[PDB]
Amino acid sequence: DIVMTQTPLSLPVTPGEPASISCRSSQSLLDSGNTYLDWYLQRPGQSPQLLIYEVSNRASGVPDRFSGSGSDTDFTLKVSRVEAEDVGVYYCMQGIQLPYSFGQGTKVEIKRTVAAPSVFIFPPSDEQLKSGTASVVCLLNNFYPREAKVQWKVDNALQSGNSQESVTEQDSKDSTYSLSSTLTLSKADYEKHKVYACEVTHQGLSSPVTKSFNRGE
Amino acid sequence: EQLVESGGGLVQPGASLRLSCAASEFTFSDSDMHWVRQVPGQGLEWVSAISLGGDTHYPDSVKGRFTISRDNAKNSLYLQMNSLRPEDTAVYYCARGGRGGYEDDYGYFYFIGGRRSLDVWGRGALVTVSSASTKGPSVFPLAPSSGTAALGCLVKDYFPEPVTVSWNSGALTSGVHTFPAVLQSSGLYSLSSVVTVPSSSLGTQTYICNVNHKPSNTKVDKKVEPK
């Protein structure tokens, strides 16, 4: 089967600045008179869509700041001016021989100015406590860059191993991330302790921010 | 032009599952049709294709186990999957390939342009191959606290993926973040969906999270209120 390889696998770029992605086939994609090499864009939470076909033809709706070039076995996707809405994963695909095969994907990340998170803490709902479980949620909202640290403290005891984090894909308009950390406790343990706190460390914060609440207040 | 996949859900290893794809706003019988799959977080792998004359093609990873078929009368493509393995767990997309037709004196033809491209893709159907059973979620409110306020819903303890969440039946989309699900140590998934809104709206604007977990037939609308 044809092996497709793409580079770089991550591409950070500032809106307004150009970008390019290289693809390389293990065999020639020329049919002595078309070359069957395509580019697909997968935006966050969407399926792939065709961006360029046959090396250099733009699919419907694709503006001319995108172009493709190459020949035989080496190909390049170029964007002359990136926009924040370009965030996604770009894939090369050969169609000269079944099975069609894809390169690994290049994740375009949009660079922007540092943005500190807004932090919010949520106690377990009375509804959940009635069910017999307790989840505390800490939300870090609309921040950049992605690296953030969340620590949980329960009556000043550091929690280790009983929380899980989930992070959004970069937003297509403001190029930020959001993050949730969920601390899981049994109802008995939640009801034994008083102060619940999430401490956030981020490049945009001059010192760590703590949001906390007292069970019952 | 639209492709809408159906059939996705949970199946145990060794069993079989049939996906369908309904085509609309295009002459279905005049296109080749393909299936491509993607394990969440990973790249793309071509699964199968059927020409407008019903010839079928397969890579070796599924050859012998999957069968593609079409019923032009119904504007539908099918992928019958047998002897499933955990590693076939993936989102399966149907996609339209080369365009052509049939003329009835001269036979099948293809347009030269776009012949080996996939120009229309469906939204995908997640197939999960697992010996765990279906479990519907609990939906709990994340109440806004006592500038900008945050609220949400916690969709806890469900299997398999996926769950969808909208706010106010789709009317509320700005400021909404629905997080990727996390697999808890129990083997069930959980996710949170949050929205940031003006604090001044909390007394008067109604916020409702609409949760849908199709594998368990669980649909819930949960009003989230300040306490």
Side-chain angles (χ1 to χ4, degrees):
Chain A
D1 306 337
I2 321 293
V3 179
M4 297 304 245
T5 188
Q6 283 172 239
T7 194
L9 306 168
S10 284
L11 182 40
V13 54
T14 297
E17 280 59 71
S20 67
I21 296 165
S22 290
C23 188
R24 157 192 305 295
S25 36
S26 58
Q27 305 172 212
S28 166
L29 312 184
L30 180 46
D31 205 356
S32 67
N34 292 331
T35 300
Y36 291 116
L37 187 280
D38 294 353
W39 292 98
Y40 301 89
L41 167 57
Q42 186 168 28
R43 299 191 189 280
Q46 294 200 357
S47 24
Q49 60 194 265
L50 176 65
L51 191 71
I52 295 198
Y53 65 96
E54 279 172 45
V55 178
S56 56
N57 305 99
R58 282 187 276 115
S60 160
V62 175
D64 70 352
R65 63 195 179 72
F66 293 92
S67 70
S69 68
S71 58
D72 184 52
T73 61
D74 297 85
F75 305 89
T76 307
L77 175 68
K78 292 173 181 185
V79 188
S80 65
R81 182 181 66 206
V82 166
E83 314 214 298
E85 292 74 31
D86 293 338
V87 67
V89 174
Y90 291 78
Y91 286 99
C92 54
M93 187 202 73
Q94 65 85 17
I96 190 93
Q97 167 184 306
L98 272 36
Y100 292 172
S101 28
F102 293 91
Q104 307 96 306
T106 297
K107 189 212 120 193
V108 167
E109 181 205 330
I110 300 299
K111 308 199 280 333
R112 59 148 285 155
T113 60
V114 179
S118 300
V119 186
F120 306 86
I121 189 167
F122 298 95
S125 66
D126 299 326
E127 288 96 318
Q128 182 189 10
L129 296 173
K130 206 242 181 193
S131 291
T133 67
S135 307
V136 196
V137 176
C138 182
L139 162 67
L140 284 54
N141 198 50
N142 291 348
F143 60 91
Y144 186 91
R146 187 171 195 286
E147 296 62 49
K149 158 167 245 182
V150 183
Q151 286 177 125
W152 289 97
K153 277 144 210 128
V154 179
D155 281 340
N156 289 109
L158 178 58
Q159 304 294 304
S160 182
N162 51 358
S163 59
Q164 300 187 279
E165 293 187 347
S166 184
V167 184
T168 57
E169 306 217 47
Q170 201 173 24
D171 184 77
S172 73
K173 289 198 225 63
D174 72 16
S175 313
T176 65
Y177 299 94
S178 298
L179 179 154
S180 74
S181 177
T182 304
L183 173 74
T184 303
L185 312 173
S186 70
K187 174 182 183 161
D189 285 357
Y190 176 72
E191 282 167 358
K192 179 168 195 261
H193 297 103
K194 181 52 84 142
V195 50
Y196 294 82
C198 70
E199 188 193 57
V200 171
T201 299
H202 186 262
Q203 182 181 340
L205 293 170
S206 50
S207 67
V209 162
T210 298
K211 289 283 141 53
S212 62
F213 67 85
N214 291 314
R215 187 191 28 84
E217 288 195 1
Chain B
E1 270 127 11
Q2 155 105 71
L3 296 172
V4 182
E5 304 86 335
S6 289
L10 174 67
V11 58
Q12 44 182 137
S16 69
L17 177 155
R18 178 193 218 210
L19 297 166
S20 75
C21 173
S24 286
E25 316 296 48
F26 80 86
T27 309
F28 175 73
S29 61
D30 289 345
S31 295
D32 295 343
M33 290 307 299
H34 302 243
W35 289 98
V36 174
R37 76 183 177 182
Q38 172 172 50
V39 178
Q42 303 215 278
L44 300 169
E45 180 204 349
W46 178 88
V47 165
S48 174
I50 171 171
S51 62
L52 28 70
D55 324 303
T56 58
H57 304 76
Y58 305 97
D60 293 340
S61 64
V62 304
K63 184 100 161 155
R65 297 191 296 116
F66 297 9
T67 313
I68 186 176
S69 65
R70 66 195 301 158
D71 178 335
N72 290 357
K74 309 193 99 282
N75 292 322
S76 306
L77 178 75
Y78 300 102
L79 179 80
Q80 177 71 58
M81 282 176 293
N82 319 295
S83 178
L84 281 155
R85 313 145 137 190
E87 322 89 77
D88 298 311
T89 289
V91 175
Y92 286 76
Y93 300 101
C94 55
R96 182 180 80 177
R99 168 73 213 253
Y102 183 76
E103 285 277 14
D104 196 289
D105 57 41
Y106 274 75
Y108 286 110
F109 62 94
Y110 279 94
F111 294 92
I112 297 71
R115 220 168 29 80
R116 307 279 284 199
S117 299
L118 312 172
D119 73 338
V120 180
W121 293 59
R123 55 190 78 248
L126 178 63
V127 169
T128 298
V129 181
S130 172
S131 63
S133 299
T134 298
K135 174 75 188 80
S138 311
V139 179
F140 303 118
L142 302 168
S145 153
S146 44
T148 294
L151 56 105
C153 295
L154 179 62
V155 183
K156 211 185 170 293
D157 292 328
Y158 66 87
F159 193 84
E161 291 212 72
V163 310
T164 55
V165 181
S166 66
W167 288 88
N168 292 354
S169 303
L172 173 58
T173 58
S174 65
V176 174
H177 296 297
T178 301
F179 293 92
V182 168
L183 183 58
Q184 293 165 111
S185 54
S186 65
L188 304 174
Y189 286 94
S190 168
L191 71 73
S192 273
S193 178
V194 305
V195 58
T196 57
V197 304
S199 286
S200 50
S201 78
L202 293 181
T204 53
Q205 171 72 46
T206 291
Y207 294 107
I208 294 167
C209 64
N210 328 278
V211 181
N212 183 11
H213 182 239
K214 309 144 308 309
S216 67
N217 261 47
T218 301
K219 265 163 233 284
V220 179
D221 297 321
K222 167 62 173 212
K223 173 181 220 270
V224 175
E225 277 191 27
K227 165 192 141 294

